[PDB]
């Protein structure tokens, strides 16, 4: 059996991951302070990266990337965009910024009927080998109160004569690829003594010309209830069992 610990009980995502892992009959959960674990589902604040990868005979994997804070706190994110040569002036997709002060989108795309404003959240997963996996299911937080990609796509076809892939998704795959390639040297664990994966939540907004802008990145996202079951199994399949194998593809591999 493989062993894991859970040190963030308030995590709705990895709670479901803990359930599925235990249901395998090949994973068993240890006490939080038990060091002899394979997989850590660690805390959000002051996660002790410095003590991982030091137990002999144990391959250790954690569900966070040390240094990902540089992309998930909006203060760090704006500093990263302006200073980074790999981005900087080339960003036509990050609103001008100096919480912190940013421009406002005068011209949002308005879903109708009802003149509705929205933002889009897609979930991205980065495994221990820094392959970038975009979850084919996203969701628009419309102003339940959630529109999914099948509806939004058919709206785009019948309202504006284009598809979700061409109008918006292309830019999204470019933005996700661009930020994560930037900090890859800073946070990769490819030749470290422990390994990292992490689930990310990218938030986008679309203006009235079908141009996508990046609002913020969240390092500990929740999912939509409809989709919890499919994404959490993919985390186990692609990020956890890839390292600890057992006895369709809901993801899109973003190439680099």
């Amino acid at each position: 059996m493989y062993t894991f610990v859970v040190r963030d009980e308030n995590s709705s995502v990895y709670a479901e991951v803990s359930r599925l892992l235990l249901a395998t009959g090949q994973w068993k959960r240890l006490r939080k302070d038990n060091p002899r674990f394979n997989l850590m589902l660690g805390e959000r604040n002051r996660l002790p990266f410095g003590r991982l990868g030091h137990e002999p005979g144990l391959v250790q994997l954690v569900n966070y990337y040390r240094g990902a804070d540089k992309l998930c706190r909006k203060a760090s994110l704006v500093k990263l965009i302006k200073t980074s040569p790999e981005l900087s002036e080339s960003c036509t997709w990050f609103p001008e910024s100096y919480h912190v002060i940013q421009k406002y989108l005068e011209k949002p795309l308005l879903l109708e009927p009802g003149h509705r404003k929205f933002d889009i959240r897609s979930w991205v997963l980065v495994d221990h080998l820094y392959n970038i996996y975009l979850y084919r299911e996203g969701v628009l937080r419309t102003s339940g109160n959630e529109m999914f990609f099948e509806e939004f796509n058919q709206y785009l076809m019948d309202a504006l004569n284009t598809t979700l892939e061409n109008s918006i998704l292309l830019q999204i795959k470019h933005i996700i690829r661009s930020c994560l390639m930037c900090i890859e040297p800073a946070i990769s664990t490819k030749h470290l003594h422990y390994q990292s994966f992490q689930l990310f939540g990218f938030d986008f907004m679309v203006d009235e010309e079908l141009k996508v802008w990046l609002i913020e990145v969240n390092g500990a996202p929740a999912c939509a209830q409809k989709l919890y079951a499919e994404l959490c199994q993919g985390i186990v399949d692609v990020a956890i069992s890839s390292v600890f194998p057992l006895a369709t593809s809901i993801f899109i591999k973003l190439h680099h």
């Binding site: 059996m1 062993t3 240890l30 006490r31 302070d33 038990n34 060091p35 002899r36 137990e55 002999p56 005979g57 144990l58």
Partner: protein
């Protein structure tokens, strides 16, 4: 760094005598005392337990003690009985009658100063004395009562040296008298205070191992001692042979004993054998931790290991040894305390014990050892509540309060072993 061995009583002299036979074969020493071994590894650290003599013969640094002459004469009539220094036989004629008080207070007091004089002569010869090693039983009179007396008086003369005992616990399955719980509770009070490390060889466990594992329907004392001499050979390996770990008694005590009173170790051995296939290193490891291979009738899954020391003997891949030892800890990490990091230490020796080509010996300081002290405390109270058989002790000058003090000190020991079983 020399060790002085002392054996007291029938059980102590019998398990002690088998111990010296076993290790004398491993070091290639014959009953005449002369050496006939192939490897100079056998002679390298032989000074720990043997004294070099004229004609380059080796004489065990052993003192044989009893209050009856019979057992000593049988050791002298034994195969290796000639090897023991004739002066190191210290005996009397009265006997102790399975009465702790006769060994500790009355009959034993006369002989004790004689034994200490033999100890002193051996000690003065020593260049650097590690400490002492005592084989005895806790349920008789001589080993239980006079043995704990000698420990008390050795500590007075040598306060800085280490006291290590192999103590055989009584069991109704292999019993001599109904007063064995009285003798055992009284002795444990002493061992708690005056020893640094005690191996709990439980006669109940030895009987069960002979019965249900080795399929011996009615075991002899020799059958049990065969298990004891194997364990005693396994746990002294790192003292007698050069290895990766060149060990002594104090370093063992420092690393195995987190709190001074919790120094009662569960021995274990694999493979269990009756008086040609060799075990693969994974088999050795699985059996060595198996409760069915413990020399104390305690379920280690009912407790948690505070510390663990394990020995492997034979020619095997040290890589596979630590892959397998790490595997058990990583697979059963619940049963090891999280507040003592890396509390399992393995050693490897190339020379296997006679007969087997691969072997594993286990020394555990597990909190499950309190099952053994509960059992002896339950038998003790059943009698003491009604003061039964107590006149055999009050007629030798003892008081009921001294029984009360031992009962409660041992019941404290059990609660202390339970404190840490639940601490986080």
């Amino acid at each position: 760094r020399e060790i002085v061995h002392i054996q007291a009583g029938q059980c102590g002299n019998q398990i002690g005598a088998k111990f010296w036979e076993v290790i004398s074969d491993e070091h290639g020493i014959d009953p005449t005392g002369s050496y006939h071994g192939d490897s100079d590894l056998q002679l390298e650290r032989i000074n720990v337990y043997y004294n070099e003599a004229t004609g380059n013969k080796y004489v065990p640094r052993a003192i044989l003690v009893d209050l009856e002459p019979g057992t000593m004469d049988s050791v002298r009539s034994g195969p290796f009985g000639q090897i023991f220094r004739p002066d190191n036989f210290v005996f009397g004629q009265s006997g102790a009658g399975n009465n702790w008080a006769k060994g500790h207070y009355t009959e034993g007091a006369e002989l004790v100063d004689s034994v200490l004089d033999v100890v002193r002569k051996e000690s003065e010869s020593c260049d650097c004395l590690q400490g002492f090693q005592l084989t005895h039983s806790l349920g008789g009179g001589t080993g239980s009562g006079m043995g704990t007396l000698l420990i008390s008086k050795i500590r007075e003369e040598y306060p800085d040296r280490i006291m290590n005992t192999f103590s055989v616990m009584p069991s109704p399955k292999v019993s001599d008298t109904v007063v064995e719980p009285y003798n055992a509770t009284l002795s444990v009070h002493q061992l708690v205070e005056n020893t640094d490390e005690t191996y709990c060889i439980d006669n109940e466990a030895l009987y069960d191992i002979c019965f249900r594992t080795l399929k011996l329907t009615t075991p002899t004392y020799g059958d049990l001692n065969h298990l004891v001499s194997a364990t005693m050979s396994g746990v002294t390996t790192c003292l007698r042979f050069p290895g990766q770990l060149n060990a002594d008694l104090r370093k063992l005590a420092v690393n195995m004993v987190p709190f001074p009173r919790l120094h009662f170790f569960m021995p274990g051995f694999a493979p269990l054998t009756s008086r040609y296939r060799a075990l693969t290193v994974p088999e050795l490891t699985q059996q060595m931790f198996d409760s069915k291979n413990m020399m104390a009738a305690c379920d280690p899954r009912h407790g948690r290991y505070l510390t663990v020391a394990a020995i492997f003997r034979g020619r095997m891949s040290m890589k596979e040894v630590d892959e397998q030892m790490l595997n058990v800890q990583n697979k059963n990490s619940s049963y090891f305390v999280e507040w003592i990091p890396n509390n399992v230490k393995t050693a490897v020796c190339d020379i296997p014990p006679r007969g087997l080509k691969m072997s594993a010996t286990f020394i555990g300081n597990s909190t499950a050892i309190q099952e053994l002290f509960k059992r002896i405390s339950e038998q003790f109270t059943a009698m003491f509540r009604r003061k039964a058989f107590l006149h055999w002790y009050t007629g030798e000058g003892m008081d009921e309060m001294e029984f009360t003090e031992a009962e409660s000190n041992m019941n404290d020991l059990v609660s202390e072993y339970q404190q840490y079983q639940d601490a986080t």
